[PDB]
Design a protein around this nucleic acid. Structure first.
Length: 896
DNA sequence: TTTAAGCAGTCCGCG
DNA sequence: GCGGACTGCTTAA
């Protein structure tokens, strides 16, 4: 098979690589890599290497990587550009795998582990590792087995062996209910003492050295703890065996680097790719959210769980590892990282960096053409102007239709042809509104321009535009393979109904393309065994297709971020500004064209149809469109939705397109790519008293949506942006209540809202304290801690933490609030024994029993309700011109 | 290693 | 009590 790397490191003048050879066997090798860099040379000198500006370069081959680095410094010292890939690992990968990498994940050892450390005197710090490791579950993807290491004897107690039969029994039977599917995959191993457990775990590790190492919070806890515990007991020399190259690097107060291993802590993968913001990141919490699986329940402190219920302690360790696996089975973040890493040809852990990922993608592409990348240069950090956001008039908006531009920034880069080497010059700029109103003179008759004054060549597609266009088109291809494989899968399922009783084999087809009628016919004749094998292949193809297209998507959307980063090799302030400024013109230009068009077709003058707009979208008030015809005319809700859908697709789109083409010519761009499609159609149920939607201000609105891009919903769905219902800092119960209030406003009306408001306010007191607690990240605690008392300008949540700290002092085993993590926050009635107006504790958890009852008895319900629920609800109704309080008479409906 | 914007809360100035 | 500054936090896109 095709060879591919697993990991790569640079240690001195040598590169250490673990890879899968032709035979599919994992190998290792140390190479004295001789890198090359480049420098400009006189024109007279013929060479095949040219930088992106078309200038000739001479190749400099070095004896070792050290010599190359030193050369760069001397060139910097002298003040001349030193071109080429300065990250030698990347250059090494590029030279060694000079082709599109085809990898086989079944050959990559992905390890998922978790440890337990009974610690009576507080949290067991990894840097100290002063307490024995009494449990370790390590799942290996090649073996598909859960290896469990259990310490039976420790200074904290001697226990009996763990029982798998009791582990299997359901909870209602006193068992731990360890998933039936993994029970037969557990390799249990008891140990008489800790030294023996560790020695065997370390041997196990050297035999099955992880390639990808994951788990929950393994980078900040499990890894450093295991490393230091082994170092303190057996010596540093033995601890370094955790690295397949026996090279580690301890980053002082403490992150441990194991060379030859790619660590992808799942907590980081989750934060990087889930596009959410959770109130807590404890595995239990994330687990409930993702899998709806209750919390691994156990009684008492964890520090006494092994001693009191060793059976449960061990099953707890096992299930913790399994949950992460379940999350990944659903999110596929590991496979996404592999797919992305191999596409760019970088160390897999580099997927966390758009800059590193795109630099490699562009490097490999340019190298194939024998071109030489520019030296990375330092730029002063300067913020540039961003997107345009219209100030909306706060109010209710009955009918609304929105339109979105397709991948705006990437599309702008391609249309205008923006790249460092395509800069052709500048033109005299007029105020932005002059280009928006087509008043200013045409910037150029020869170059492609942006309203910020920049001009670019049109004869050639630039480096960045070409690369982004490639990824753009590739996503189309893979998403297409995904869909075809999906459909092809249905055909095979349709056939599995009555499989022939034949002797045959799986048809050798390409599942990325819709089956022809010839293949469909043949499939109708296949046997059950053959068809099932085909369905398996069809699905594997679909999954791969999904992952590739998602990977392509992330790349497309992260390019702009990179281009706006001073550390990116292709960063250019003028180019970043050209992109965003052109984006502002595009949105406001089309806003004008849409208002002009709509006023014309509705036979009216100077009417403002575009009610809002942000970055790449506009929201059109369709009220007058509905009136021009008349509501009575519409049979039912679905009728007017159909009408507006047709009105958009047949009359507005063409006008928007004509509008953008004019703009493209005006700016003399390389090609038209400003495509704006109809997104949502919002409104209240025909007949009802609902208001449909509302805006309270910029980036804060709510809409009752019936159709999203041609997808007609069975039931209208609420699209809420910015409002407290969407914020992780809003208490759970309040998020839900505020959402029902909005639903009632948009779909049913004022009286419906008033009814619900009164009820929630009356039952408020009975809600679980955790459900009505606010949440907040806690940064710089120490900064405001003076003698355990709040200092000047101390934040409300920080004060709460200090209060909690003062009340748990002296209690060695009390849960500690951690710097940079999140906490629940509750206000306290004056006179409370805590000594302050509020208290905070670790989010995603119950507050410690030593003060729980007191907190529950001094919680200030009145302030809670007013601040988290009433204040924001008043803001919604004020903007919507509604009353959340029922009145006694008609005249009471007015502000007399 | 992106910019734009909205709230929660301090801390002050106020005959 | 109420509006500025200004710090902290969190979303939109």
């Amino acid at each position: 098979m095709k060879e591919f790397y697993l990991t790569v490191e640079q240690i001195g003048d040598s590169i250490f690589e673990r890879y899968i050879d032709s035979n599919g066997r994992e190998r290792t090798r140390e190479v004295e890599y001789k890198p090359s860099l480049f420098a400009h040379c006189p024109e007279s000198q013929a060479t095949k290497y040219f930088d992106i500006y078309g200038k000739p370069c001479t190749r400099k081959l070095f004896a070792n990587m050290r010599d190359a680095s030193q050369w760069i410094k001397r060139m910097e010292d002298i003040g001349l550009e030193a071109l080429g890939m300065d990250d030698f690992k990347l250059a090494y990968l590029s030279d060694t795998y000079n082709y599109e990498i085809k990898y086989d994940h079944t050959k990559i050892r992905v390890a998922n582990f978790d440890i337990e450390v009974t610690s009576p005197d507080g949290f067991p710090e990894p840097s100290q590792a002063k307490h024995p490791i009494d449990a370790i579950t390590h799942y290996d993807s090649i073996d598909d087995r859960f290896y469990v290491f259990d310490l039976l004897n420790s200074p904290y107690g001697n226990v009996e062996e763990w029982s798998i039969e009791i582990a299997a029994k359901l909870q209602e039977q006193g068992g731990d209910e360890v998933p039936s599917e993994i029970i037969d995959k557990i390799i249990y191993m008891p140990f008489d003492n800790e030294k023996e457990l560790l020695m065997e775990y370390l041997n196990f590790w050297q035999q099955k050295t992880p390639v990808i190492l994951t788990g929950w919070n393994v980078e900040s806890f499990a890894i450093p703890y295991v490393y230091n515990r082994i170092k303190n007991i057996f010596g540093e020399s033995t601890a370094k065996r955790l690295s397949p190259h026996r090279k580690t690097r301890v980053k002082v107060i403490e992150i441990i680097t194991l060379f030859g291993i790619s660590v992808l802590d799942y907590i980081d993968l989750y934060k990087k790719f889930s596009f959410t913001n959770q109130p807590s990141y404890s595995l239990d919490y994330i687990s409930e959210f993702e899998l709806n699986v209750g919390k691994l329940k156990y009684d008492g402190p964890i520090s006494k769980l092994r001693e009191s219920n060793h059976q449960r302690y061990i099953s707890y360790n096992i299930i913790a590892v399994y949950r992460v696996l379940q999350i990944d089975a659903k999110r596929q973040f590991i496979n996404l990282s592999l797919d992305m890493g191999y596409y760019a040809k970088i160390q897999i852990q580099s997927v966390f960096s758009p800059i590193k990922t795109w630099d490699a993608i562009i490097f490999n592409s340019l190298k194939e053409q024998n071109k030489v990348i520019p030296q990375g240069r330092s730029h002063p950090v300067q913020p540039y102007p961003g997107a345009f956001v219209k100030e909306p008039i706060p109010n209710r908006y009955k009918y609304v239709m929105s339109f979105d531009l397709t991948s705006l920034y990437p599309s702008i880069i391609r249309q205008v042809n923006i790249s460092p080497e395509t800069i052709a010059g500048t033109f005299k700029v007029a105020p932005l509104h002059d280009y928006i109103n087509a008043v200013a003179e045409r910037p150029s008759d020869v170059y492609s321009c942006s309203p910020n004054g920049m001009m670019y060549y049109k004869d050639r597609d630039g480096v960045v535009p070409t690369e982004i266009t490639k990824v753009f088109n590739q996503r189309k291809e893979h998403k297409g393979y995904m869909l075809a494989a999906q459909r092809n899968g249905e055909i095979i399922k349709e056939a599995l109904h009555n499989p022939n009783l034949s002797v045959d084999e799986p048809l050798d087809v390409d599942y990325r393309f819709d089956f022809s009628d010839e293949i469909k016919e043949k499939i109708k004749k296949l046997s059950a065994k053959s068809l099932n094998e085909m369905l398996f292949r069809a699905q594997r193809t679909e999954v791969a297709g999904m992952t590739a297209q998602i990977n392509r998507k992330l790349l497309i959307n992260s390019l702009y971020g990179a281009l706006g980063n001073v550390w990116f090799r292709y960063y250019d302030l003028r180019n970043a500004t050209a992109i965003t400024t052109f984006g502002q013109m595009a949105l406001q230009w089309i806003e004008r064209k849409v208002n002009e068009y709509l006023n014309e077709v509705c036979g009216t003058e100077g009417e403002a149809f575009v009610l809002y707009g942000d970055t790449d979208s506009i929201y059109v008030s369709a009220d007058k469109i509905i009136d021009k015809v008349g509501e009575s005319k519409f049979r039912d809700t679905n009728h007017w939705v159909d009408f507006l859908d047709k009105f958009a697709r047949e009359r507005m789109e063409p006008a928007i397109d004509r509008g953008f083409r004019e703009m493209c010519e005006y700016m003399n761009n390389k090609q038209h790519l400003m495509f704006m499609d109809r997104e949502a159609i919002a409104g209240p149920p025909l007949g009802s008293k609902g208001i449909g939607g509302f805006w309270t201000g910029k980036k804060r609105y709510a809409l009752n949506v019936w159709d999203m891009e041609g997808t007609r919903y069975a039931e209208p769905k609420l699209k809420i942006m910015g409002l407290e219902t969407q914020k992780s800092s809003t208490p759970k119960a309040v998020q839900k209540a505020l959402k029902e209030c909005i639903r009632r406003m948009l779909q049913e009306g004022e009286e419906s809202l008033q009814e619900y408001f009164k009820e929630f306010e009356k039952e408020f007191r009975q809600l679980n304290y955790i459900s009505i607690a606010s949440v907040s990240s806690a940064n710089n605690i120490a900064k405001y801690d003076v003698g355990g008392f709040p200092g000047p300008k101390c934040p409300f949540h920080i004060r709460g933490i200090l209060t909690y700290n003062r009340a748990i002092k002296g209690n060695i085993d009390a849960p500690q609030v951690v710097e940079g993590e999140k906490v629940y926050v509750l206000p306290l009635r004056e006179g409370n024994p805590f000594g302050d107006k509020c208290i905070a504790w670790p989010s995603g958890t119950e507050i410690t029993d030593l003060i729980k009852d007191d907190v529950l008895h001094w919680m200030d319900y009145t302030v809670l309700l007013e601040k988290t629920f009433i204040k924001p609800l008043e803001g919604f109704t004020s903007a919507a011109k509604l009353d959340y309080e029922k009145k006694a008479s008609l005249f009471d409906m007015f502000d007399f």
